[PDB]
UniProtKB/TrEMBL annotation, chain F:
Full protein segment contained here: 59 to 115 of 229
Family listed: Belongs to the complex I 23 kDa subunit family.
Domain of life, per lineage: Eukaryota
Annotated protein name in UniProt: Subunit NUIM of protein NADH:Ubiquinone oxidoreductase
TrEMBL record, chain H:
Keywords: Membrane, Mitochondrion, Oxidoreductase, Transmembrane, Transmembrane helix
Protein name: NADH-ubiquinone oxidoreductase chain 2
Pfam name, any one: Proton_antipo_M
The enzyme's E.C. designation: 7.1.1.2
Subcellular location: Membrane
Family annotation (InterPro entries): ND/Mrp_TM
Residues with N-formylmethionine modification: M1
Record-stated family: Belongs to the complex I subunit 2 family.
Organism this protein belongs to: Yarrowia lipolytica (Candida lipolytica)
UniProtKB/TrEMBL annotation, chain I:
Subcellular location: Membrane; Mitochondrion membrane
Gene this chain is encoded by: nad3
Name of this protein: NADH-ubiquinone oxidoreductase chain 3
UniProt enzyme class: translocase
Gene3D superfamilies referenced in this protein's UniProt entry, alphabetically: NADH:ubiquinone/plastoquinone oxidoreductase, chain 3
Entry keyword Ligase: no
Source taxonomy: Eukaryota, Fungi, Dikarya, Ascomycota, Saccharomycotina
TrEMBL record, chain J:
Entry-linked PANTHER family: NADH-UBIQUINONE OXIDOREDUCTASE 21KDA SUBUNIT N-TERMINAL DOMAIN-CONTAINING PROTEIN, OXIDOREDUCTASE 21 KDA SUBUNIT, PUTATIVE (AFU_ORTHOLOGUE AFUA_4G04750)-RELATED
UniProt xrefs under Pfam families: NADH-u_ox-rdase (PF10785), NADH_u_ox_C (PF12853)
Record lineage: Eukaryota, Fungi, Dikarya, Ascomycota, Saccharomycotina
Record domain NADH-ubiquinone oxidoreductase 21kDa subunit N-terminal: where: 16-101
Keywords: Membrane, Transmembrane, Transmembrane helix, Ubiquinone
TM ranges: 38-58, 70-90
Cytoplasm in keyword set: no
Domain NADH-ubiquinone oxidoreductase 21kDa subunit C-terminal fungi, chain residue ranges per copy: 120-163
Entry-linked InterPro entries: NADH-Q_oxidrdct_subunit, NADH-UbQ_OxRdtase_su21_C_fun, NADH-UbQ_OxRdtase_su21_N
Protein name: NADH-ubiquinone oxidoreductase complex I, 21 kDa subunit-domain-containing protein
Signal peptide segment: none
Length: 171, 138, 86, 340, 66, 57, 83, 469, 116, 167, 76
């Protein structure tokens, strides 16, 4: 919760998870894939993560030491989601963060690559991006048409993929 | 990269060096010429401690107004065992870079807005006073 | 038409800033290795990119997509030793 | 380590090598503004002459007046020069391409311009003649007084941004510029821009007629190239500020429609061409602006100092507080509050 | 006020130690504040870590000794 | 008798449009811009010479 | 904690023994207003808040207005004299 | 309604000429009167010392501070009423006591500064307000600029004000360096047991106190209080007293202070003996101003002293206020006037005041009896109730050095009367003009308060018992 | 190692390479080559910089507001607008007192030819 | 946007009378003040010009009994409205504290609260704020009628909690 | 000459007069007075006529208030 030093030195410890906690399948996803699939792991693993922050709340002082069962719980289901999308829409999902690896991860960059993915995951993995807190008669901003902030350079692959989504009638 | 370690202990001594030249100066303006360097060493110490914000705040206001103000006046004369590396974690609770400056702008405006409101009268007094003195109306 | 001799040093400066911007594109992409720059360092993003360097192995922003972790991922993770601040 | 020391050299020959031909360009302009030819004897089309200026100027002597502390006459040229040269970090040159990106851009951008007064006040104190001192007084008082409004519109710019990073402003500015909604802001900024530079719509203080042959110090030599180059660095530095936070910074149009026609994939050619066109939009705005400074330098006489302080505090600055009352209010009418 | 604020406007290092102290005071009248003392001392260890520094210099002296 | 504020034919808004928006400033600015796009006069003296009368001395 | 203490204390010792130069008193006082900062700012730093920074921005401002007021007091002190 | 006055009136003064300077002050006089009269009922805002913390843990409004909050308006009505009214309609009294343009602005700025101390919970509001009133007194000293002693005293006040600025700020910094608060709930008789917050709160106290004339820092305020003009001193020897002393008595941050007790002894001693060999009246009067703040240091030591404080405040801010106005009247009858800014200096000059009138003398005599505790006066019961608080908590040697201080004080207070009733050889028989009526009527009011103030001795005790507890 | 810190350090050395190049390249360094009583002023010289400090200072006072302006929705608006509306009348004190008027004693002798 | 989520005293009186509110909203204070209260405003507005005419009748400025300028009368009228309005707000909002006579307004706030319960909207109305800002702005406006001598401060907030029984 | 009629003799005439003689004051002052007056009156209208506000942005992880039910899945 604090920025680093004048001259901080990094350090690590070659030790292990000692006795009781079994090993987990720890998320080996870099920022751009998990940022892309953030809505879907928030959609499927909603009450699990909600339980996580609830249990971290009620464990005042215990905190970190209490909910190890739950840190085991909430990561694994997200790993299940990303493995299912590794099997599901790996071309288009990868393409979404092939676009999103530029633009400083600004989500404003890759609308045309995004809407191709929204049909795909809702087809096979049958999940959906939903923005909570958005009261009705208010357009969700990745659903709207003619945005004000149009991005800098759309990638060359997903624009052709978008045209082919129109020609195949998948859109 | 062990030369990196003593950075802070550089600028402390360079501070101690500088202040001696404040209180040992022939001319008046030579003293403030050392003093602006003391402000700069201070701002580098603020950048080195981890407040890059206030380093430049001071350059805007100390060697911005008040030093240059002192220069402007002094022109107008006629004739001359705590050695423990603290451990820093990483938590993911923050969501947006509400930096130090944002939260100043929140506490000055919500929690303690009355201080800024009376500070308006202090800045009022800064206007009235020099006009209260240096004018001789009619 | 126009006096070209007047615009000729302006043509120079218009070329000089252009060549500067071209080289300042190329060097930054060559540092990044294929992607653009990052015009906004967030604290969220700073911890994130530390994690990403920690994940990919060696490289800066290789940005890999993997199901699970490597075995060194349980061991590569570091803390930061801030100095005593005297 | 290797690719950054070339990253700073290419920027040096992009800027320091350009600011000389700026001083050639001003002569070419004022030639055709007053219906005569520019320098033509010196180079091929009369280019290069700033080299012949400097190399001669580096060969003249270091005659020093007896009333001046010589160290002070070393410090003020050097610090004015390096002030207007370390103002060159977070000029943006395309998206996020600065020398060092840091999230507090404007604060550095503005504190170094705040340091810009500190050399010119210090300079007239050496050679302590009474006219030589009081000229420094008259210069520094306007040099702070419009440094106010120069500073003071930078906050209403970021009432649309709410972020101190400079390259964030242009990506905010993609939907629309800031000059085209806020037009009289540009006019008062343009006169505030030529104020903080020594420009003679406003620089009365370089009156050789008033002083005993005094412009500032007549201190010449390789001292003379220092304040001189600092002045012309200050020119296109404040032009750069005008470029990003008021005008289209590196933006020209959408140009994605063009790109998907041209390329099929990302490649170093594509980065090359996009960085070219972003730098060229920045260049064309910057190069029209450096011309506009001369275009107002020609057509107008100088001021009275009474006119100059009346021009600051009475006619410009209450209108600036009127801006401070209308733009938070226009922000308040709609929801419209900007987030980082 | 700026009571339990942080750099990023969240909660500081010892907010919990502060609030567990304030929970210690809101349920407690004077002449019974003595039981509040270990809640207070837990706060003070946040600020200056005097018990922690005393813990660490001893084990550092043992590590120096061997 | 010279005209006052109220013996003036134009509106205060119209007068102050010329005040703030600087009509006669941009007017002369347009003048010198027009002279930018015209011919100079000067001659290349070691290559061209000015007028010489027969009664020059 | 060393640097703000030492700037403050050396400014204090400079204020005491250097009366008869009067501007030196001002600038030692100004460095005192810097030294209180250099202790307080790092207390904000070490204590994970901006509450000390809240007091710090105010004492920056008050150091400013001090330099605004008292230097006009100086100009009043020298108008009635000559030198 | 201070700010609601100020923001209108500085626009009003800026839109005004120079001859309106009396009339603006007449307006502000009547204004503050009607602020007091029409809004007095806010003492009803509590019944059992019910204390409000307003603007979010920042200000503190209570049973106690409402009194001082009324008191400052009451004295400002008098100070304003000096300016706005002529003394006489003479040439002399218009080249004397003519206010500047910006003066009445600086007063309400100072009253804002004084009230935001006494109502302050936070140290930050404390620091802002002490800077505010310090800048106020900087200007209000320096405003009568064309006097050499005035500017010299302004600089002299300035540098000690800067030291106490940085010293109070260093105390706040140190208290923050050991604790993450700035308020004063964090004391609550528990941290005092287990943490050495003695020396830090002591250093807070000393820095707050040395803006008074506390006897280590002794000569410099006295040099001010004579080098000021005779008018400004009657304001600036009062407001910095009762502002910060009401703060320090409101929060008893140093209880059984070893330091404050010794400084209280030394304060009383050197003030009493410093009043002795002096012929300059502004000196003598300022040393009276010292020793009475000497008694204030005693009231700082105690626990739960809201009676003896407030009663001695309303004693002192009447008596000390009124004796100036008496010698402001007395300069008409004297035979030698120097120094346009400061007409009387030497106490010799009012040699024959009783053969001018008996009644200004009698009014002077009872107020100088009021400083020495003469029992049928209001000035007495102050010292009486001080001592009822002193031996309440066993400051025995403090009580006997109070007696020594009272006797050595009362020696030099009578020196005024030694001068005042003697022979003059050149007596008045007929003055043309009279003194402006309601200006003198204020002094008549302020003196019947002191004489007949033991009448409401009972009712003020009942109001004390009901409201303040 | 970052080019940002290289930039502010290299430029004084570039200035030294431009500084000592004259001392290397010049020659004939220094050959042989009343101010009794007055200095003159108005308040319009001395006052501009002194009055400049609160108006410079208020920009840095207003500066933490503009970063955080989304958080203080519809209320920090109200606070800051009260702050400004104090400072603006503080400004229009001086313009009605004409604090920067530097007026001339070149009066055309208003008083007429009253004769005999 | 209506949960207080702070621990507020409930019906904690300030005098012998029942309260209504800890800070009445500024529109409400106008909406409940007695007709005798408006007389305090009017007599305060008349007091200042009569005060200056008084004060010059007592002792004139330049020895002549002369009425002052109309400029002084207009500005005294302004400040008289200031004093009258401060007195009006001060005398009115005590009755919400239960510290002076609370007879008709306790009836009217058994009406208008019940009038908007049946109307189905919020008992105080929606402010345009996140609830944390509602808390902090009400912490600013809490008890701020005290210290009316120093500065006027008011309740423009319309936050949820008011020291009511439950809502 | 354009000396003064006075604000307190005829207002609207004096407003016209200042607009003819000192627009540096009055056209800063008009922009200044148009701020808060429009800020007071227009904001009820926009919620009534144009469009209502936005949903508030969350500032942390939003915590609901529930009782930690039995949640199965991913034991091993």
């Amino acid at each position: 919760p604090r920025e680093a030093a004048a001259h901080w030195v990094p350090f690590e410890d070659k030790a292990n998870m000692p006795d009781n906690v079994p090993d987990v399948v720890e998320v080996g996803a870099t920022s751009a894939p998990l940022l892309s699939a953030s809505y879907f792991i928030g959609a499927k693993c909603k009450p699990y993560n909600d339980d996580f922050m609830l249990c971290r709340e009620e464990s005042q002082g215990s905190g970190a030491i209490d909910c190890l069962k739950e840190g085991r719980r909430v990561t694994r289901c997200a790993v299940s989601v990303i493995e299912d999308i590794n099997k599901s829409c790996l071309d288009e999902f990868r393409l979404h963060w092939q676009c999103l690896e530029q633009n400083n991860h600004q989500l404003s960059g890759c609308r045309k690559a995004e809407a191709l993915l929204n049909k795909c995951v809702f087809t096979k993995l049958n999940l959906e991006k939903k923005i909570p807190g958005l009261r009705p008669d208010e357009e969700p901003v990745f659903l709207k048409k003619d945005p004000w902030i149009k991005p800098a350079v759309d990638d060359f692959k997903s624009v052709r993929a978008y045209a082919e989504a129109k020609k195949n009638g998948t859109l | 990269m062990y030369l990196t370690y003593y950075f802070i202990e550089i600028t402390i001594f360079l501070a101690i060096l500088c202040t001696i030249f404040i209180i040992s100066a022939k001319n008046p303006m030579v003293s403030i010429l050392y003093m602006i360097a003391l402000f700069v060493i201070a701002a580098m110490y603020l950048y080195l401690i981890g407040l890059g914000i206030f380093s430049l705040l001071y350059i805007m206001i100390y060697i911005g107004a008040i030093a240059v103000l002192f220069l402007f006046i002094i022109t107008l004369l006629d004739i001359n065992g705590n050695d423990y590396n603290t451990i820093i974690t990483q938590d993911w609770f923050n969501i947006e870079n509400t930096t130090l400056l944002t939260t100043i702008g929140n506490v000055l405006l919500t929690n303690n807005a009355f201080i800024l409101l009376v500070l308006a009268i202090v800045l009022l007094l800064g206007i009235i006073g020099p006009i209260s003195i240096t004018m001789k109306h009619k | 038409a126009i006096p070209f001799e007047a615009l000729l040093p302006y043509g120079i400066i218009f070329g000089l800033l252009t060549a500067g911007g071209g080289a300042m594109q190329v060097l930054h992409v060559y540092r990044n290795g294929g992607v653009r720059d990052r015009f906004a360092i967030d604290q969220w993003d700073s911890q994130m990119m530390e994690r990403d360097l920690r994940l990919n192995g060696g490289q800066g922003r290789k940005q890999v997509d993997q199901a699970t972790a490597p075995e060194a991922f349980k061991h590569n993770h570091v803390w930061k030793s801030e100095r005593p601040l005297i | 380590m290797i690719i950054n020391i070339v990253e700073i050299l290419i920027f040096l020959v992009c800027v320091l090598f350009s600011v000389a031909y700026l001083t050639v360009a001003e002569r070419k302009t004022l030639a055709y503004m007053q219906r005569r030819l520019g320098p033509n004897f010196v180079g091929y089309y009369g280019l290069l002459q700033a080299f012949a200026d400097a190399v001669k100027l580096l060969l003249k002597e270091i005659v020093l007046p007896k009333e001046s502390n010589y160290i002070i006459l070393v410090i003020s040229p050097l610090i004015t020069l390096i002030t207007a040269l370390i103002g060159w970090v977070v000029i943006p040159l395309g998206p996020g391409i600065t020398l060092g990106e840091l999230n507090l851009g404007i604060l550095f951008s503005l504190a170094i311009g705040s340091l810009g007064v500190f050399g010119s006040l210090l300079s007239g104190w050496s050679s302590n003649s009474k006219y030589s001192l009081l000229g420094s007084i008259r210069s520094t008082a306007q040099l702070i007084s419009y440094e106010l409004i120069l500073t003071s519109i930078f906050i209403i710019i970021i009432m649309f941004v709410s972020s101190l990073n400079i390259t964030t402003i242009i990506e905010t500015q993609r939907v629309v510029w800031y000059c085209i909604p806020l037009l009289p802001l540009l006019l008062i900024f343009f006169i505030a821009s030529v104020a903080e530079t020594a420009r003679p719509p406003f620089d009365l203080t370089e009156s050789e007629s008033e002083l005993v042959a005094g412009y500032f110090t007549e201190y010449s030599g390789s001292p003379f190239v220092f304040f001189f180059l600092a002045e012309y660095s200050n020119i296109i530095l404040i032009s750069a500020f005008n470029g990003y936070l008021l005008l289209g910074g590196y933006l020209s149009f959408n140009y994605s429609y063009l790109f998907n026609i041209l390329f099929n994939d990302y490649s170093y050619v594509s980065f090359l061409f996009e960085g070219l066109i972003n730098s060229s939009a920045y260049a064309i705005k910057l190069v029209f602006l450096m011309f506009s400074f001369i275009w107002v330098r020609a057509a107008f006489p100088r001021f009275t100092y009474d006119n100059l302080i009346n021009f600051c505090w009475i006619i410009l600055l209450p209108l600036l507080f009127g801006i401070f009352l209308i733009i938070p209010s226009t922000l308040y009418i709609f929801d419209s509050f900007p987030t980082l | 006020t700026a009571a339990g604020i942080s750099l990023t406007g969240g909660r500081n290092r010892c907010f919990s130690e502060w609030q567990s102290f304030m929970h210690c005071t809101a349920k407690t009248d004077a002449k019974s504040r003595a039981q509040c003392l270990p809640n207070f001392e837990d706060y003070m260890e946040c600020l200056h870590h005097t018990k922690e520094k005393a813990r660490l210099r001893e084990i550092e002296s043992v590590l120096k000794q061997k | 008798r010279p005209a006052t504020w109220e013996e003036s034919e134009e509106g205060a808004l119209s007068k102050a449009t010329k005040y703030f928006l600087l009509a006669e400033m941009f007017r002369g600015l347009y003048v010198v811009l027009e002279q930018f796009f015209r011919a100079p006069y000067t001659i290349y003296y070691p290559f061209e010479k000015g007028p010489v009368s027969p009664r020059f001395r | 904690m060393f640097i703000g203490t030492i700037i403050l204390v050396l400014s204090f010792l400079g204020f005491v023994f250097n009366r008869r130069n009067i501007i030196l008193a001002f600038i030692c006082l100004e460095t005192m207003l810097l030294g209180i900062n250099l202790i307080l700012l790092r207390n904000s730093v070490l204590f994970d808040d901006i509450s000390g920074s809240l007091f710090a921005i105010v004492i920056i401002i008050l150091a400013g207005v001090e330099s605004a007021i008292g230097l006009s007091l100086l100009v009043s002190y020298y108008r009635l004299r000559g030198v | 309604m201070l700010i609601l006055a100020i923001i209108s009136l500085i626009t009003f003064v800026s839109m005004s000429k120079l001859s309106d300077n009396r009339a603006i002050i007449r307006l502000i006089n009547i204004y503050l009167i009607l602020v007091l009269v029409l809004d007095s009922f806010l003492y009803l805002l509590f019944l059992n010392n019910q204390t409000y913390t307003v603007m979010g843990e920042l200000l503190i409004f209570n049973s106690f501070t409402f009194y001082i909050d009324m008191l400052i308006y009451f004295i400002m009505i008098v100070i304003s009423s000096l300016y706005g009214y002529n003394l006489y309609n003479n040439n002399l009294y218009k080249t004397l006591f003519e206010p500047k343009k910006e003066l009445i602005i600086l007063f309400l700025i100072n009253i804002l500064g004084a009230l935001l101390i006494v109502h302050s919970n936070d140290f930050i509001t404390l620091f802002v307000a002490i800077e505010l009133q310090s800048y106020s007194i900087y200007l209000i000293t320096a405003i009568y600029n064309s006097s050499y002693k005035a500017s010299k005293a302004s600089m002299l006040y300035f540098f000690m004000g800067g030291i106490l600025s940085i010293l109070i700020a260093y105390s706040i910094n140190t208290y923050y360096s050991v604790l993450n608060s700035y308020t004063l709930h964090s004391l609550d008789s528990l941290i005092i047991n287990t943490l050495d917050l003695n020396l830090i709160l002591i250093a807070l106290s000393l820095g707050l106190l040395f803006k008074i004339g506390i006897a280590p820092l002794h000569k410099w305020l006295i040099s001010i209080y004579e080098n000021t003009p005779i008018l400004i001193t009657i304001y600036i020897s009062l407001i910095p007293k009762i502002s910060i002393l009401s703060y320090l008595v409101l929060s008893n941050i140093s209880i059984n202070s070893l330091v404050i007790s010794i400084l209280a002894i030394l304060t009383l001693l050197v003030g009493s003996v410093g009043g002795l060999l002096q012929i300059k009246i502004k000196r003598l009067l300022a040393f009276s101003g010292l020793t009475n703040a000497g008694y204030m240091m005693l009231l700082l030591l105690l626990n739960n002293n809201e009676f003896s404080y407030l009663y001695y405040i309303t004693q002192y801010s009447i008596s000390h206020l009124a004796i100036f106005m008496i010698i402001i009247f007395s300069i008409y009858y004297i035979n030698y006037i120097n120094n346009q800014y400061n007409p009387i200096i030497y106490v010799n000059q009012l040699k024959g005041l009783i053969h001018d009138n008996a009644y200004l003398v009698l009014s002077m005599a009872i107020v100088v009896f009021s400083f020495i505790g003469i029992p049928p006066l209001l000035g007495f019961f102050g010292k009486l109730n001080i001592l009822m608080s002193i031996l309440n908590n066993g400051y025995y040697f403090i009580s006997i050095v109070l007696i020594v201080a009272s006797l050595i004080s009362a020696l030099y207070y009578l020196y005024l009367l030694n001068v005042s009733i003697q022979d003059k050889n050149n007596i008045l028989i007929n003055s043309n003009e009279t003194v402006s009526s309601v200006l003198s009527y204020i002094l008549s009011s302020l003196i019947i308060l002191i004489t007949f103030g033991f009448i409401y001795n009972s009712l003020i005790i009942d109001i004390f018992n009901v409201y303040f507890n | 190692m970052n080019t940002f810190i290289i930039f502010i350090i290299l430029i004084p050395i570039v200035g030294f390479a431009l500084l000592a190049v004259n001392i290397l390249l010049a020659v004939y360094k220094p050959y042989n080559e009343f101010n009794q009583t007055r200095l003159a002023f108005n308040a319009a010289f001395i006052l501009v910089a002194i009055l400049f400090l609160p108006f410079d200072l208020e920009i840095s006072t207003l500066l933490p507001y503009v970063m955080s302006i989304y958080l203080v929705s519809n209320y920090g608006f109200t606070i800051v607008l009260l702050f400004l509306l104090i400072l603006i009348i503080g400004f229009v004190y001086e313009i009605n007192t004409n604090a920067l008027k530097i007026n001339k004693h070149n009066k055309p002798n208003t008083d007429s030819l009253i004769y005999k | 946007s209506s949960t207080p989520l702070v621990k507020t005293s409930v019906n904690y009186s300030y005098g012998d009378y029942p309260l209504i509110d800890a800070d009445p909203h500024f529109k409400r204070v106008v909406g409940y003040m007695r007709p005798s209260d408006y007389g305090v405003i009017g007599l305060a507005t008349a007091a200042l010009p009569a005060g200056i005419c008084f004060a010059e009748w007592l002792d004139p400025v330049k020895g002549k009994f002369a009425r002052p300028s109309v400029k002084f009368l207009r500005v005294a009228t302004m400040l008289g409205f200031a004093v009258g309005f401060g007195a009006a707000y001060a005398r009115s909002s005590l009755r919400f504290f239960g510290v002076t006579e609370n007879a008709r307004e306790y009836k009217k706030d058994e009406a208008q609260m019940a009038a908007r319960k049946a109307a189905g909207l919020e008992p105080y109305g929606t402010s345009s704020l996140t609830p944390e800002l509602q808390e902090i702005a009400a912490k600013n406006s809490a008890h701020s009628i005290a210290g009316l001598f120093i500065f006027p401060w008011f309740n423009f907030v319309n936050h949820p909690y008011h020291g009511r029984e439950q809502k | 000459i354009n000396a003064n009629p006075g604000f307190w003799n005829g207002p609207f005439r004096y407003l016209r007069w200042s607009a003819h003689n000192r627009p540096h004051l009055f056209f800063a002052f008009a922009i200044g007075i148009a701020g808060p007056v429009a800020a007071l009156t227009l904001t009820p209208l926009r919620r009534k006529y144009l469009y209502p506000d936005h949903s508030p942005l969350p500032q942390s992880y939003p915590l609901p208030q529930r009782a930690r039910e039995g949640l199965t899945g991913f034991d091993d």
